[PDB]
Design a protein around this ligand. Structure first.
Ligand SMILES: Cc1cc2nc3c(=O)[nH]c(=O)nc-3n(C[C@H](O)[C@H](O)[C@H](O)COP(=O)(O)OP(=O)(O)OC[C@H]3O[C@@H](n4cnc5c(N)ncnc54)[C@H](O)[C@@H]3O)c2cc1C
Ligand SMILES: Cc1cc2nc3c(=O)[nH]c(=O)nc-3n(C[C@H](O)[C@H](O)[C@H](O)COP(=O)(O)OP(=O)(O)OC[C@H]3O[C@@H](n4cnc5c(N)ncnc54)[C@H](O)[C@@H]3O)c2cc1C
Lengths: 480, 482
């Protein structure tokens, strides 16, 4: 055994997963094909939920001051996100290159074995372990591990070598993205195609080129600038061929998702599990959020404290999130790429987005705060959902207590009787008697059991199963 | 020869002819077809269309009409009951029956309806119109003050005056088949295309075939049934080739609208003015409602009582409505025809329909109750909008605003028995009816009086209208020395 867990890929997903595992004292080897981070800006910022999970690991202070923005929108149609509490899109200026840099520094200091320059070329499941063929700076060797996780992007080697079913719709077009230095472009339903224009920090202009009736090309592959410039000039009639390319990329509208996130001792996360239209503002957030769901569960299984059905909750909870992720990205794409044939439907929708019922509903889709797992029956509003950041009188917060990434039993009523019911699971969770003071708290909530990912598994009152059942379910068997 | 000539005796033509006859305007209607073909086409009509029929006492010519709060937008079910009076009506009554009601009503009102007469040309003589028609005898020329084109989407009148007809061309072809002798279940998202199945009274089944990637075809005749059956089987897997076809037809999704509803002394109404994807449930309702807007205004012009800007309010009011019409049908059409590539958008919208704000909005678009004309400034809720039917205490007799609007003359409703404002409307006596009556209340706020156009829309109301009553009266019912 070279490590309990091997992760292929050091993007946002793999790096977050490595951090989540290391927090739980698990040994993890990360295989990254690239010798360094690309430094691609890609998307700017991340959703409210992603900001919340960073805060749960004390990673927010590492970005400096982030700027919130309730200026959200859906498929080009402007929507107010302030109508739903805390759904504000955030970090609108923080590029993925910076987020990757923060995460890789975080994983490394935690003891992640990040081996850059190593490419996964093969994998077989021994049933009781996984054999991983690797190509590194010396040559081709073989690592073996308890579990393999594929966080190796949309072209995932792991996915193909294990034989995951990857259904969906193929690409119907090609689009261009270009960050440009040296042109004055104004932030804009013309024929020939659609175009988006926006500014970036440091005098950089970001353009999106979606020409009408453009064919989907398999790329290696950064696009040649002149090909992007001619596509642009064909649509807008503005010559930009004398600009300076900061970064160019080509992408398709292909959307696919693995039928199962788990095959034996091999799991998938991020773009490896779900691929979709990159310019939709959800991908990185989905990969980081997949990693936070799986990390503490995979950790418990390795330690042997987990119940036999825990690891399967990764697929159980995250696959529906992925389905809804593809629906969201596909729907927004239609309102974006298609020309005037989609305009009447764009208009009808634009007439509905003023109604606060609609605004809140669309905001919850994008922010990712609508995410609600099935964790059992109960009338409590938090059950299966994220625990919102509460500030506790003890001077700590729920986000701060979740930094070690262990389960929390929060005791608000100072009840000695339920603290004794939790006794067998001592060492697996922390019992914290404190007073909520932030503090959106429903009805007469006296206690709440919080999963390491921040999701509420149980809550008094309003949960069918009682505390010992919820504890056994999410934190494993304990002789009683 | 004729004060007005209408080309076409479908819903738009017949309704307009009736609206003119009510005003005493002599009108000749030209219909190329010797007899009705018997196309059921659509079933039922919208709430607003029901309301305008009630305004002329035409509802009881159908029998009893059945309302339904079960609305739909692009297939997605919507509760129309959340908006008062927006219920779909007559869901069993075919357009052929509605046409038959309107023709008898026109004929009894004195309308000169000439079937077997096809319009072939028109020159606008600056102050008159010369119409060339080929009837039973042969070619002959009619001279008229006004020619209204209600001759359908392939309007000969539109093409002969040179209206601009901008829009989008057809992208596909689709079939309609009224069949007998097949047991077919109504569906509740296939590849190869989509399909609709619905029952029709008389054990007749109605199917819509929309095969994926079918090329648009311009054909004058009906499609052969073997072509509709082979498309159907390609999509569903069910063989219907042994069916008996009542009616077969083929349509495209071309949507165009004339830039101007009026060119000199030639006007357009119905599919002549705006064509779209027939699957939306709006066309006939829009055509009939165009005819109601134009009729009384054109009558005022013929009688020389109209203000010089009244006739242009036909284009002014009905063109934007026609734009909404193309948006509505096209948006809905996308939620029907496109296969699994539209499904994510269908799903999202389906989640929103449950919100009463949304349901009410879509219900207004489809029912026609959203229609609001710019008639002037004011904070009064009814201003420029349709006057809802109000039960009234007429002296000591029960009445209704619908009943009062039957003669198709303007109304000044006095709720508070005020004879001061009853003298402000004195000059326009013989043009409107001043009615002192008491409504239920249903009236918004402290409404004391309301001026109603012959088409049912409120032109002025006290309080909450910037203009004065004499100003509003001059604007809609003509100049009067004072
Ligand atoms: C132009 C653009 C704009 C975007 N904007 C946004 C946005 O605003 N918001 C948002 O949430 N998302 C956005 N995204 C999507 C986001 O960038 C990706 O979804 C995110 O990177 C996915 O994380 P990942 O770790 O799973 O995949 P990856 O980032 O691709 O990480 C995969 C890593 O694994 C490595 N790898 C691949 N194969 C192997 C192998 N065989 N062996 C070893 N290593 C391997 C790769 O080198 C790579 O570094 C955008 C994407 C694009 C292209
Ligand atoms: C399959 C189908 C289903 C539909 N379902 C619905 C529905 O559920 N609800 C709804 O509101 N609408 C529906 N519609 C639309 C509705 O049928 C039309 O919009 C409606 O007929 C428009 O009325 P119109 O008078 O302007 O046109 P038309 O009904 O077509 O009348 C035009 C008349 O002018 C005559 N004409 C043509 N050329 C000449 C000429 N040169 N000289 C003299 N006369 C001429 C024609 O013979 C015809 O009688 C449907 C349409 C189709 C095709």
């Amino acid at each position: 055994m070279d490590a309990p867990v091997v992760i292929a890929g050091a993007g946002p997903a793999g790096l977050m997963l490595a951090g989540e595992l290391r927090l739980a004292g698990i040994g993890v080897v990360v295989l990254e094909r690239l010798p360094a981070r690309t430094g691609e800006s890609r998307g700017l910022g991340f959703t409210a939920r992603t900001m919340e999970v960073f805060d749960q690991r004390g990673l927010l202070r590492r970005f400096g001051e982030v700027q919130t923005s309730d200026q959200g929108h859906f498929g080009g149609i402007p929507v107010d996100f302030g109508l739903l509490d805390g759904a504000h899109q955030a970090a609108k200026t923080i590029p993925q290159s910076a987020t990757e840099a923060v995460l890789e520094a975080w994983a490394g200091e935690l003891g992640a074995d990040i081996r850059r320059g190593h490419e996964l070329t093969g994998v077989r499941d021994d049933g009781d372990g996984v054999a991983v063929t690797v190509r590194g700076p010396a040559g081709e060797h073989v690592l073996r591990a308890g579990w393999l996780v594929g966080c190796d992007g949309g072209r995932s080697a792991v996915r193909k070598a294990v034989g995951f079913d990857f259904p969906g719709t193929a690409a119907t077009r090609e689009m261009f993205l270009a960050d440009l230095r040296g042109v004055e472009l104004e932030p804009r339903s013309l024929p020939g195609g659609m175009v988006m224009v926006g500014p970036l920090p440091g005098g950089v202009t970001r353009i999106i080129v979606c020409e009408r009736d453009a064919p989907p090309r398999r790329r290696t592959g950064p696009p040649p600038f002149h090909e992007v410039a001619d596509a642009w000039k064909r649509i807008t009639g503005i010559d930009i061929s004398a600009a300076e390319p900061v970064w160019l990329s080509a992408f398709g509208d292909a959307t696919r998702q693995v039928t199962e996130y788990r095959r034996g001792r091999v799991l998938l996360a991020g773009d490896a599990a779900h691929v979709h239209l990159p310019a939709g503002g959800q991908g990185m957030n989905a990969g980081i959020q997949d990693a936070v769901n799986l990390g503490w569960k995979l950790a418990a299984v390795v330690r042997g404290t987990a119940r036999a059905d825990l690891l399967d909750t990764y697929h159980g909870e995250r696959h529906p999130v992925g389905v809804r992720l593809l629906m969201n990205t596909r729907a927004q794409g239609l309102l974006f790429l298609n020309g005037a044939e989609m305009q009447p439907l764009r208009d009808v929708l634009a007439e509905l987005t003023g109604y606060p019922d609609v605004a809140r509903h669309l905001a919850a889709m994008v922010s990712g705060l609508e995410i609600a797992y099935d964790v059992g029956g109960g009338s409590h509003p938090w059950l299966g959902r994220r625990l919102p950041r509460l500030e506790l009188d003890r001077p700590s917060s729920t986000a701060e207590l979740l930094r070690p990434a262990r389960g929390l039993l929060l005791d608000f009523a100072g009840n000695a009787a339920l603290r004794d019911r939790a006794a067998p699971w001592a060492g697996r969770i922390d019992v914290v008697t404190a007073r909520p003071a932030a503090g959106r708290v429903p009805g007469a909530t006296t206690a709440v059991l919080v999963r390491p990912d921040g999701h509420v598994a149980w809550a008094a009152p309003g949960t069918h199963a009682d505390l010992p059942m919820a504890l056994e379910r999410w934190f494993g068997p304990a002789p009683r």
